[model samples]
Target: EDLRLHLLLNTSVTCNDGSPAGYYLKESRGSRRWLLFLEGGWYCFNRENCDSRYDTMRRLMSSRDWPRTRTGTGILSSQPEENPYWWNANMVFIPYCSSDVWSGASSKSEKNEYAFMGALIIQEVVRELLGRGLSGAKVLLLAGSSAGGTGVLLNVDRVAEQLEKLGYPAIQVRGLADSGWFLDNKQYRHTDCVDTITCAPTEAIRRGIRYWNGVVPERCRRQFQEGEEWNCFFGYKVYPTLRSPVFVVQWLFDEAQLTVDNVHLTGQPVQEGLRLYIQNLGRELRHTLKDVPASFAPACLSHEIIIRSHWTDVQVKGTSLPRALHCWDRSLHTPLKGCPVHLVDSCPWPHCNPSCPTG
Candidate 1:
């Protein structure tokens, strides 16, 4: 049977509607390993966009649909067959109701119309967990998919700092981010598309930084000019500044990138320039990923895998994401054995690997 967790509310921090923000929790019987997962949905950059999201995707911004219990899947799965390494850890699923990619620091008012407290929510959760035995936790893995995955990259170091400051110095805090390594590259075509998911990469973040009062890691924030604080949103730009070890899981030909860059692959014969653009996307991903200390990237056209049943199915050079993560985790404490830290695909085109997931 799958691990099912019950909901607990933290009214001190809140969702967009001022309803109590909360997370689902399941304590380990005796294990000290913990998994804190951030749920992902696209985000909003302005009041109207968030209002539109509220109307169409109300569950993401309000706690009204949060169930009494939630079943864990993929990495959070209790089945050893599904999650080989992290199944028995204390598990938590943090819902996203702030519409802020878990980084905004603002609250609702007549001046702002909604609360953007995603960053505060994670901080609050950690504080509450310590009182409930997390102080004894030896390992805490912060993991998530898509926007939530980006949240992992943004907050892992901050969370580590928090834990140390709170007097839990022995816990090893690490990040496992999935499908969130987006490039700040030139679009195949330029348009500030009205669809929030389809908006230009840099443009959306530029607006969002001000609208949400988003916070980036302090070290990364200092690397950019005051006017260009949004640069910290890019994985390539902010990665070098992070002190904590993180494993990145991304698709070489990410579907979300294609949609936002305005490259369509549905045609019988893809346009010549569009096909060329896709080639560049793969190369760019491979180049930047080469420097990551530990990673698992495949030449696949997909998104969000850490929570999928097939998280073990996809491979980069025959090594699955879990294997790389297990190695990375071990390397922190002692000499790593048998496996290498990096597991990236060298294939030329998108979805070229036979192990790529098929849905």
Candidate 2:
């Protein structure tokens, strides 16, 4: 039976195209609800040759927190976590799929391919839980470090919307993105030379201003009207399409592979691009702040606020902080309380990232 369940679980755990997917699921013996935590960035799972990080996540979700079931199935304890602890009670699964790390090649299709695989895992986990009488069980808190957080921010909304339509409960699909950063449209605009406008720190901010100025031809040089992008891909149109809320966490000096360094293409410094993106998100929420009904929080531990203060300045003074300086600081993480101000900040930091210090 164990072999059969393992086979069935492995078989069911696949992308829409039938590719092998990466994720770990542990059911709750008491309630039979399952949580699948998604792993971030470059990752894979093969118990014999599985990466240590993957094994750590498997232990965190299934072994360390809960006990083995009387039925001999390894499951988390059945109780749903309340206000403070909602993060753990939820079923956890980690999804990994970036071919570049594996094959030393990162094509456009490969990037999007891994994207869909992560998306589908969200789908299958919900479906499996509901089948087990855990009706209306949506992702309580989808958390990941760095690239994994990027995946959660990118896909959580779609997952929530799909579950909402299916009559789920007052679902809360939140995310904790530790040192979170990802690609942007401007990534393809700058030259690939190492120290060019798209490559190094100094040139990075210069590139961002260039892109912003280009988008708003009629406005002041630093002015960026909502929804306007010199580069179309830098906007928040993608999030609106998903219709979900997300909590973003980021650090000041993460040094993770961002859109510029991560891909063959390059963009400005991630902090600069983030400043522009969050301003765009604020413009999106103003019209119906309560209508869309999604929350965004930033647990900042950086010495700079990459996105928050940038937007405030853009709105109030038609300018932003100078290059290489951000508003958040390391002390921000010390408070550790969820607050309203946090919901509005764009650069979240000192949060959690499970995939850091590994490939």
Candidate 3:
């Protein structure tokens, strides 16, 4: 069962367009553990796209007749027989309606054009949770999928910093980014635009920088080249600035990026270029998070992990996904010293990693 709770803000805690946004919190007994998950969905780059998103009930933009969200995937599973370790943990599922990776800081309140105030939403929600018991949490993991995963990457450090400011400097905080490592597609222009003459992917993302009015941290933005400040929205640009320990869960060949972002790989009119692109992306990912604790990058052609059947079934070397995660989680309880183990899958197959065990 999900218990929906609205934010305490009177005016600015709403979504991108003044819609009431809320979160679901489920309590458990005897566990000082907490999981704060941000919900994921597609982003809106421009006014048309934003309006199009507003016309749906499935998305989080409109609160009218909003669907009840539950906490039951990956580490947030409510069933003890399945998840075991995290079945009894306290869980908070934050609904995303800001279309800005929950990073925007807007103050607009006009009728049709509401504020994209995701930053404020985060501050308010976490403050409420801190008052409710998160401040004393022994272990807090901030995790999300897709756009929400990107949120985790973008906000994990900031959230931890806030918690520290609230007098919990000794608490352990970690993050997991699942299927949200969107790469830089500025050089490639094969993806055609539907309504406009420019490339859809490039134009939409670039326009998003202006539309959403997102503020990139000075530390992350300063690392960019003279004119590449907006690149902060891309994973490669922000990974270096992250202070909290994080685990990235991604696919070597993301299906959504292939279809939506128009990344073509093997067996096409010409896939050599695409294959090289994927290889380079993999190398970059490896290089970027080399020192980070643990990550799961199965070489499959899918979008998101954690919620899929492959989450527990897949393996890297001899370690299964669930086992690897269990080991990583255990490491958190120990003194912070050596680098955590890495068990990323590098198999180049459309299906599960061949080295993974069936049973």
Worst 10 residues of 3 by lDDT: 193-202
- Candidate 2: residue 227 lDDT (0-100): 40
Best by TM-score: 1
Q: Per-residue lDDT of 199-261 in model 1, one digit per residue for the tens?
A: 777787788889888999998888796878888877877888999988888898888777778
Model 2 ranges with Cα > 4 A deviation? 1-19, 28-35, 43-88, 98-116, 136-139, 183-242, 257-359
- Candidate 1 regions off by >4 Å? 1-9, 334-337
Residue pair clashes in candidate 1? none
> Estimated TM-score per prediction?
0.96, 0.43, 0.84
How does candidate 1 score on lDDT? 0.84
Candidate 2 local Cα displacement, residue 312, angstroms: 29
lDDT of 2 at 305: 26
Error of 3 at 82 (Å): 2.8
Report, for every candidate in turn, its global Cα lDDT versus the true structure: 0.84, 0.34, 0.67
> What does candidate 2's lDDT look like per residue over 1-359, in tens digits?
11112111444344322344443444544432233444444333222222343345443212223222221111122222211122234344443443111111111244222212344555555665566544744335555554455455455555566667988856555444333432332332445533322353223323433321211112221243554332222113323333344434333223443334333213445566555543443333232223322223232223212112121221111112111011121122233232222323322222322212221
